[PDB]
């Protein structure tokens, strides 16, 4: 029933408007049918695990096409798939990765509370098994226990159909936290701690980073200011505040007893 | 995350979603809540014709909310089947404060001499003359004097 | 048949100062509460909760229930009378032979007051009339025959809802009684429909039960449904928590003085899980001071198990062995190993208690514990470190820590001044930290700016007993 | 619930317990762990 939805199956990329059109096919099931408010009867739901299936390959090609709305979207599908009460379904291929995908999406978008909802839905599954899970998690707690080479290290083999523009993104998570942490409470650095914690010797990147934010280019030194600190006295008059302070809470005095 | 499936900019996929809206949408009232100004890009935009809808589930989750004014701004934007229905819990208070703003609206007009008063809005007075007409089929007309003195004219 | 005459005595005292004595307290009465009734009889619902109820057996079987429900007609002064036609039936359990009419006569018999003559107008006594009866049942899921019966006698509340918005064509104030009891039996609902499984369209029972305490009575519903709510999200997964993010209205009277505090300690655990230390650990502190008494063993003691995690996490804790009774002391077996785990700075007993009771771990279920656990062994190390010594090195500190190398360690002493313990630079030639400690900091303005948050929270606290003193 | 039996009945304190984990051990012992040295 209704085969020409499997029309862009096996080759994943004639095109970026053959996928449009497979949107458009994609569009007459979303005319005809509609899987989340679909309540049981799961046979009108085995086209929907096919759909399921390739929108799982429409999330490829989100991040085959770098659209962040549409990998947020499809993403947001197969987070609906999962939530629809009939989880009684057969087992998702990606499931192990596309987790993942927004995971290290989320360690692309620097998440607080959404990691942890995160390590809530599917908790048993993280330690025992699933390295598109198990790795990020681990992985995560080694960035925070402060290794940057770690990430160079898990890069050896990070590929993870397709894991390269989110360790793209968290080379970028690295190199402007290096533009927050490369003298937050620091004396100074030297070229050579710029070969360290930066890499690439010496782009124009770094080059910048000594003239975007600021920057002291001490002569094979590094300054982020003379100071640092930018002379902190902020009133040298902390007291006629503290008399508006006296102002309404002299009033506050007044009215009660 | 059921409002990220909507970045889609036709109405027909706002349509499934709005699906999803009259089945889950207590379940979703968390979730709703920050889609309010996507709720607001529904209710500015006129092509998109569920925009009804839009104030629909706009009151229902201001009136989770305790958004009332704005329960009343898109309880006016919700259309006519709005005063048809016989809820005990929703719509009959959201006509009692918007029938309450009526009536403090003609107090309110009554004290304005001639005129120049708020106009009433598009899809004002229909339990007006419909549960007006209650009361008269009912042969009880102390309500109807009673929307009589509620009008003060 | 001598201790019989016990529920005989007790029921008849139950709804003779509840049914005529709250329904006294309710004809006209109760400007906020003058329905001292209520609270008596929640305080006599205690009491069938400490003690057997009425006829869960009681030597007999079934005996009150088909007896008491009759007849009440709320009529001429001879319905005092009728009360004594509930005394004078007596002589069937003692002097007859008793007979089975409950779990399944009850279905009519909830019926009948209401079918002896349109008794009264006030909803407490069909409130009362099918859950006096019906709450003795609640606790005896064997599941055998009594929790359907639970199931289809809270569908018989589910009508006390029905006949609770739809009652007294709409605002006396009887929610302040029967949200009284509205709030204890529909965490029985929350029980038993969770004794078999989710549910999930109680749910939506407990949505538009909480939209109906909207604003016509703001009185008990909105923070128990809002328990009930909570721990509905919280049974389940995490993703509905946002709500009180956004629909933050969380803030009764607290009139109940219990539900505030363990409702505290519940969004505690929401802040907690979600991410927190501060403001977390201050609620895991302000209800744990807001705990009532002893008078419940085990309730604080778990639930202080549960309490004190966040504060694991802090790494400054100390070992809870007065809070430990003996009873929780075999259950806090890994308890007591796990915080010695987290003050010994050893990492294979940190992987060696995890690996020994991961299990009880799972009893917890908090395993964002272990992610940040770690964590919290390097914190605590270089708290009490960066404590001591003004000029530390960190090959002192590193290598003294297993660190085996410089540049982690810049690594630890730069996310240290990125989560801000101290003002630790370094000597930057390879590492080896020049620093210093804090003092000479300030301590003479800087006290007396925190007085007025003491000193006007002392004026808060004056106008509460100035509003304290407007009670009488 | 209290159906039973019963109705008649860091500061320090995780150091406490790893002060009660080293109960007869030498944590100080001056003249003990530190002339050890040049006794030989």
């Not at chain 2, 100004?37 to 839009?54: M, T, W």
């Not at chain 2, 809005?121 to 009361?135: A, P, S, W, Y």
């Not at chain 3, 008849?12 to 329905?35: C, L, V």
């Not at chain 3, 001591?388 to 730069?414: C, G, H, M, N, T």
Request: charged share 25%.
């Amino acid at each position: 029933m209704y085969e020409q939805l499997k029309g862009e199956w096996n080759r994943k990329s004639p095109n970026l408007s053959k996928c449009g059109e497979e949107l458009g096919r994609l569009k007459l099931v979303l005319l005809e049918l509609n899987f989340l408010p679909t309540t049981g009867t799961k046979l009108t739901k085995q086209q929907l695990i096919l759909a399921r299936d390739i929108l799982e390959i429409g999330a490829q090609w989100s991040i085959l096409r770098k659209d962040i709305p549409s990998f947020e979207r499809y993403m947001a599908q197969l987070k609906c798939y999962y939530f629809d009460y009939k989880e009684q379904l057969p087992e998702s291929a990606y499931m192990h990765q596309l987790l993942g995908l927004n995971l290290l999406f989320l360690l692309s978008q620097n998440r607080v509370a959404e990691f942890h909802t995160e390590l809530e839905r599917l908790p048993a599954k993280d330690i025992q098994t699933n390295v598109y899970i198990k790795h990020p998690v681990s992985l995560e707690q080694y960035l925070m226990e402060g290794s940057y080479n770690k990430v160079f290290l898990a890069k050896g083999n990070i590929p993870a159909e397709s894991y390269t523009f989110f360790i793209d993104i968290l080379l970028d998570t690295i190199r402007d936290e290096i533009a927050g942490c490369i003298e937050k409470a620091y004396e100074k650095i030297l070229f050579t701690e710029a070969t360290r914690i930066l890499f690439f010797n010496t782009p124009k990147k770094m080059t910048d980073y000594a003239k975007k934010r600021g920057w002291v280019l001490g002569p094979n030194n590094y300054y982020s200011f003379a100071s640092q600190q930018q002379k902190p006295e902020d009133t040298t008059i902390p007291s006629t505040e503290l008399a508006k302070q006296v102002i309404e809470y002299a009033r506050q005095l007044e009215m009660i007893v | 995350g059921i409002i990220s499936l909507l970045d889609e900019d036709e109405p027909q996929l706002k349509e499934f979603a709005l699906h999803k809206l009259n089945a889950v949408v207590n379940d979703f009232w968390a979730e709703i809540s920050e889609s309010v100004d996507k709720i607001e890009v529904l209710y500015e935009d006129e092509g998109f014709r569920s925009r009804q809808f839009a104030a629909l589930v706009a009151s229902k989750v201001f009136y989770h909310l305790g958004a009332f004014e704005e329960s009343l701004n898109y309880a006016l934007g919700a259309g006519d089947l709005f005063n048809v229905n016989d809820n005990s819990e929703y719509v009959e208070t959201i006509i009692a404060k918007c029938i309450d703003h009526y009536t403090k609206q003609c107090v309110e007009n009554a004290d304005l001499p001639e005129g120049e008063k708020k106009p009433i809005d598009q899809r004002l007075e229909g339990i007006v003359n419909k549960m007006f007409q209650r009361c008269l089929d009912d042969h009880k007309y102390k309500q109807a004097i009673g929307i009589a003195l509620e009008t003060r004219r | 048949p001598p201790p019989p005459p016990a529920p005989q005595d007790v029921e008849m005292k139950e709804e003779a100062a509840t049914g005529g004595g709250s329904t006294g307290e309710a004809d006209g009465k109760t400007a906020a509460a003058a329905a001292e009734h209520s609270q008596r009889e929640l305080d006599t619902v205690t009491l069938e909760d400490i003690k057997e109820h009425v006829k869960q057996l009681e030597k007999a079987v079934s005996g009150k229930e088909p007896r008491f429900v009759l007849r009440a007609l709320r009529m001429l002064p001879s319905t005092s009378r009728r009360l004594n036609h509930y005394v004078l039936y007596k002589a069937v359990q003692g002097f007859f032979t008793s007979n089975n009419a409950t779990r399944d006569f009850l279905l009519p018999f909830l019926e009948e007051p209401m079918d002896t003559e349109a008794d009264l107008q006030f909803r407490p006594r069909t409130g009362k009339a099918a859950s006096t009866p019906l709450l003795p049942e609640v606790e005896a899921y064997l599941q055998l025959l009594v929790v359907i019966f639970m199931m289809n006698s809270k569908r018989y509340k589910e009508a006390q809802k029905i006949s609770d918005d739809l009652m007294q064509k709409i605002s006396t104030q009887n929610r302040r009684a029967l949200d009284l009891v509205a709030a204890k039996c529909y965490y029985y609902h929350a029980r038993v429909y969770e004794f078999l499984d989710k549910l999930d369209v109680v749910r939506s029972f407990l949505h538009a039960r909480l939209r109906t305490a909207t604003l016509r009575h703001d009185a008990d519903g909105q923070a128990t449904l809002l328990n009930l709510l909570l721990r509905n999200y919280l049974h389940y997964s995490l993703y509905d928590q946002a709500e009180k993010l956004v629909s933050k209205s969380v803030f009764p009277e607290q009139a109940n003085n219990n539900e505030w505090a363990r409702y505290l300690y519940y969004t505690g655990r929401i802040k907690a899980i979600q991410l927190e230390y501060s403001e977390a650990r201050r609620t895991m502190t302000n209800a744990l001071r807001k705990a009532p008494q002893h008078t419940a063993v085990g309730f604080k003691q778990t639930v202080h198990k549960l309490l004190i995690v966040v504060e694991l996490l802090l790494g400054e804790i100390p070992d809870r062995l007065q809070f430990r009774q003996p009873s929780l002391k075999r259950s806090l077996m890994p308890y007591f190993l796990l915080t010695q785990a987290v003050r010994t700075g050893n990492l294979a007993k940190f992987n060696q208690v995890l690996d020994q009771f991961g299990e009880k771990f799972q009893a917890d279920g908090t395993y964002t514990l272990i992610i940040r656990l770690r964590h919290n062994v390097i914190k605590t190390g270089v708290r009490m470190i960066s404590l001591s010594y003004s000029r530390i090195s960190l090959a002192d500190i590193a290598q003294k820590l297993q660190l085996d190398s410089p540049e982690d360690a810049e690594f630890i002493v730069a996310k240290a001044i990125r989560d801000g313990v101290i003002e630790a630079s370094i000597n930057h030639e390879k590492g080896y930290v020049q620093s210093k400690e804090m003092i000479d900091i300030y301590s003479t303005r800087e006290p007396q700016l925190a007085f007025h948050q003491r000193i006007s929270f002392c004026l808060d606290i004056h106008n509460m007993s100035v509003k304290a003193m407007r009670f009488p | 619930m209290s159906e039973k039996k019963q109705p008649v009945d860091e500061d320090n304190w995780d150091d406490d317990n790893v002060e009660d984990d080293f109960s007869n051990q030498l944590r100080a012992e001056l003249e003990k762990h530190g002339y050890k040295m040049e006794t030989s």
